[PDB]
Amino acid sequence: EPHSQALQDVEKAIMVFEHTGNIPVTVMEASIFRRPYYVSHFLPALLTPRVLPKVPDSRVAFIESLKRADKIPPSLYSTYCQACSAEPL
Amino acid sequence: LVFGGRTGNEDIISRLQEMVADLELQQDSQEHFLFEIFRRRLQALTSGWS
Amino acid sequence: TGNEDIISRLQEMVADLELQQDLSQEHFLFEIFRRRLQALTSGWSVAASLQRQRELLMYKRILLRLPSSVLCGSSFQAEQPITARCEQFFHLVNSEMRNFCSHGGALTQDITAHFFRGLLNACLRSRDPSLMVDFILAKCQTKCPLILTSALVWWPSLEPVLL
What we know:
The structure is cut from a larger assembly and holds three copies of chain A. Chain A is an all-alpha fold. Chain A has five helices and no strands. Chains A and B meet through helix 1 of A and loops of B. Chain B: It is found in: Nucleus; Cytoplasm. Chain B: DNA repair protein that may operate in a postreplication repair or a cell cycle checkpoint function. May be involved in interstrand DNA cross-link repair and in the maintenance of normal chromosome stability. Chain B: It comes from Homo sapiens (Human). Chain B: This is Fanconi anemia group A protein.
């Protein structure tokens, strides 16, 4: 459940980040004050074992706007980038 | 993945443009129904705190 | 497609000029339309006829985008100041639209409804509305009868809206 719901959470997060710009605040609330849910939801934020497009898009722009806030410990970022590297008949 | 959000239509809102523009010149002390259906959508929304 | 924003900029500027005009005179748009129709090639070559047809369907599209207040005006004040910009429209419907934007000696549902809506709008906005409607639709027999012939075709369409 903390996996499947976190998908829907980051989904709406990036959606409003497109409708708005620059990091909607509701996730920023749970970030500092709810660290268990923060890390439980931050997993699907980085679980993208898929090739990157030549140009930036919503996902990666979201992640960039996150990382400039000095959050996102670089361990999970390293894991992120290496994962995206990839007779009877 | 999510990889963004499809826009789909900028045209139907341009249709609503002429719909409500016609209704404006039509009506002329009452209140507009758009805010009413707004408040209906808002009360219908989950009052939770997630 | 391209510019579903520039047409929105047109809506902006037309509503701006509408209030400014409200603050009798004819609209400049029909003069622009006249100017472009003059500056077309006068020739009878099928190239010219198709070019004129293309240009008149574009005029139809643009007029259907802007509100129906541009055609009939709004608020016919008194009986003497009546039929302002209406005669301009009727001239345009007679000279041009009957050729191309027509079928069966009748107009298209689009501009017919746009027209009749601007009419009912201005008339109810004006005083003595039933008599002024009857007046304008009597003068249409003399200045632009195609409208009535169109209202003959598109009647099961319009009557729910107008009632």
